[PDB]
């Protein structure tokens, strides 16, 4: 990992933000060399990302480099599409929508340059309609370029070019899975399918699709434009790259910054800009993932670098790329229930473990917080959480327990004493 | 709320403006043929727009356009959230309350509305124009307890100026759907500067 950073220069993977929002020639960075890329054999791009080997921003492992050079090697009778989440499911994510808001010109390229690797046919994106204003403008961004003849059907210089069809959702979590999105792109109700039909690259719209994420297809052109040998810059021999973090919930100026891997949380939280709560003596009870990781106390987290597998060393890792912390007044038990009260409303409801199994917790979590009937429950409530893992289809269950699974870990007494606080009270 | 209809507007009636039948030519043009069969998500919502909440004869109408048995519609309108099956007001307002939005005390931008606006939660104002809810997972938690009105959002709010954002709206004034105070774009501040540059003299991976 080198020098234990993760610095930020003007040399980064994102071109500009406050400079130019509208269309043009991509005055400096973008749309630079194209006809040379596409005219060379497609699999040249395939595995040429391996110089980086992006883990992927979809909240998981499984480097993006494999799945595209993965099946969808051949082609037979039926077209292939691209479905790239723009959605945000996790509370406090916020990383998305900043990419789109002030610089859309990147991703329409990101597909066209990207889609050629798939050998795909069309391009769908998807956006939660809950963003009405910013999402409305992409069409202009599509038009303001696409109208110039930059895309389709040969554009430019190849015999292969195809346009991008925006769509919208409503009350979606649906980006909560692939093999759901490709279902509610269709117009059924969205109940995500079983994971191994034929996994997500066989059963699809009518025909094989691949579900990418935003900065997985956003940073691909610039990492195939230059690459290197700088493609692997920070992070150890395992995880490599520089992703975006967006700090939220206590800071001086919670705001995004581009930061490379293996950055410790004690300098990163304090920096960009201040630590404005107590940098210490505010107890710094932290959540690595947005909703997908339980607490860490004042322990090795602060020295624990943000590298992925570095977090699997602790009791939980995070792929979500977000930060929420706390200081003093926020009662964690009080502040984790409204993370659970959230889950109960976003779940499909097919499976018997998820449905009727999350409420069993959510109905009891309003006992502990309020303070109420006796311990030895905690010992059970742990087993429930241990009882939903292989039992649910999607990850929302595997992402349902961890907050409670990792609350019972790391804080014993805060509960034990409160059940007394109402016990002595009853007396 | 309940998900059964007590025969309100089986024949409301309802219909689309002949200006709208020329767009539905474009929507279906998106998809491939023979699978078309659901554009329902925009098409059912466009109908909400022409009206402002869709009665049960709206749900039956699109079926005659899309030839799907209209329990393959009543379903889809009871799953998602954005659609409003019952009637609503002129402004349908949201208060984000979630772990981050709780930490910055969204209750600030929430109540003190009951003392101002003078209505309870989940209840439309006695006339029309106002109602109140709360939701989860929209936009940014990087901002303050942000608030949504209808088609816009007011980021980085406080109890002091939201008194205005409603009250200037009661006057008919629309106050700039952006994070009115602090930093306008939600900037890093701490390395915001960066001095943008062309991409380092390309010709790089030309090989």
């Amino acid at each position: 990992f080198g020098s234990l950073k993760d610095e930020d220069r003007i040399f980064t993977n994102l071109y500009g933000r406050h400079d130019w929002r509208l269309k043009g020639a991509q005055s400096r960075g973008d749309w630079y060399k194209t006809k040379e890329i596409l005219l060379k054999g497609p699999d040249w791009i395939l595995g040429e990302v391996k110089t980086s080997g992006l883990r992927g921003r979809g909240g998981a492992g499984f480097p993006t480099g494999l799945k595209w050079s993965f099946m969808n090697k051949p082609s037979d009778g039926r077209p292939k599409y691209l479905v790239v989440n723009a959605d945000e499911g996790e509370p406090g994510t916020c990383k998305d929508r900043e990419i789109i808001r002030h610089d859309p010109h990147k991703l329409v390229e990101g597909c066209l340059v990207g889609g050629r690797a798939m050998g795909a046919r069309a391009a769908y994106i998807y956006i939660r309609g809950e963003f009405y204003n910013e999402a409305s403008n992409l069409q202009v961004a599509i038009r303001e370029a696409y109208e110039a003849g930059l895309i389709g059907k040969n554009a430019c210089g190849s015999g292969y070019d195809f346009d991008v069809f925006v769509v919208r959702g409503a009350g979606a979590y649906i980006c909560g899975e692939e093999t759901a999105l490709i279902e509610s792109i269709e117009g059924k109700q969205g109940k995500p399918r079983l994971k191994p039909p034929f996994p997500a690259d066989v059963g699809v719209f009518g025909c094989p699709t691949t579900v990418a994420n935003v900065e997985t297809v956003a940073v691909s052109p610039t990492i195939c434009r230059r690459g290197g040998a700088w493609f692997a810059s920070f992070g150890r021999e395992r995880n490599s790259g520089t992703k975006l973090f967006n700090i939220s919930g206590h800071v001086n100026n919670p705001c995004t910054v581009e930061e490379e891997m293996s950055v410790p949380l004690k300098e990163l939280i304090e920096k960009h800009a201040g630590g404005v709560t107590g940098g210490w003596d505010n107890l710094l009870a932290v959540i690595p993932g947005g909703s997908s990781t339980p607490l860490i106390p004042k322990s090795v987290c602060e020295t624990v670098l943000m590298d992925f597998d570095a977090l699997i060393q602790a009791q939980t890792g995070l792929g979500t790329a977000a930060v929420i912390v706390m200081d003093r007044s926020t009662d964690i038990v009080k502040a984790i229930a409204r993370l659970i009260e959230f889950y109960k409303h976003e779940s499909c409801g097919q499976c018997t473990p998820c449905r009727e199994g999350v409420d069993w917790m959510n109905k009891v979590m309003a006992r502990f917080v309020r303070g109420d009937a006796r311990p030895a429950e905690i010992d059970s409530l742990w087993e429930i959480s241990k009882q939903i893992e292989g039992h649910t289809i999607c990850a929302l269950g595997d992402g349902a327990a961890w907050p409670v699974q990792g609350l019972i870990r790391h804080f014993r007494p805060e509960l034990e004493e409160r059940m007394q606080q109402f016990a002595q009270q009853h007396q | 709320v309940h998900r059964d209809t007590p025969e309100n507007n089986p024949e409301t009636p309802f219909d689309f403006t002949p200006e709208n039948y020329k767009r539905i030519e474009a929507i279906v043009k998106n998809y491939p043929e023979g699978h078309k069969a659901a554009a329902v998500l925009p098409v059912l919502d466009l109908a909400q727009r022409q009206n402002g909440w869709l009665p049960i004869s709206a749900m039956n109408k699109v079926a005659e356009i899309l030839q799907v048995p209209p329990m393959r519609v009543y379903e889809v309108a009871t799953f998602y959230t954005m659609y409003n099956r019952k009637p609503v007001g002129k402004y349908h307002i949201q208060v984000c309350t979630t772990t981050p939005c709780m930490l910055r005390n969204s209750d600030s931008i929430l109540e003190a509305i009951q003392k101002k606006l003078g209505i309870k939660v989940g209840e439309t104002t006695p006339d029309k124009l106002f109602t109140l809810i709360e939701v989860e997972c929209l936009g940014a938690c990087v901002n303050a307890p942000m608030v949504q009105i209808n088609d816009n959002y007011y980021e980085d709010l406080t109890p002091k100026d939201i008194e205005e954002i409603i009250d200037e709206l009661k006057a008919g004034k629309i106050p700039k759907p952006g994070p009115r105070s602090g930093r306008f774009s939600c900037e890093p501040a701490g390395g915001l500067t960066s001095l943008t540059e062309p991409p380092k003299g390309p010709g790089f991976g030309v090989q």
């Binding site: 039926r78 109208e147 389709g152 | 474009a26 491939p32 023979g34």
Partner: peptide
């Protein structure tokens, strides 16, 4: 900013410039 009026966004430049589609069939 334009509350209604997705029209030309959907039907102006998109309508003419979304070729072909071939899209096949799927009769079924």
């Amino acid at each position: 900013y334009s509350t209604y009026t997705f029209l030309d966004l959907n039907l102006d430049l998109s309508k003419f410039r979304m070729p072909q589609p071939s899209s096949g069939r799927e009769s079924p």
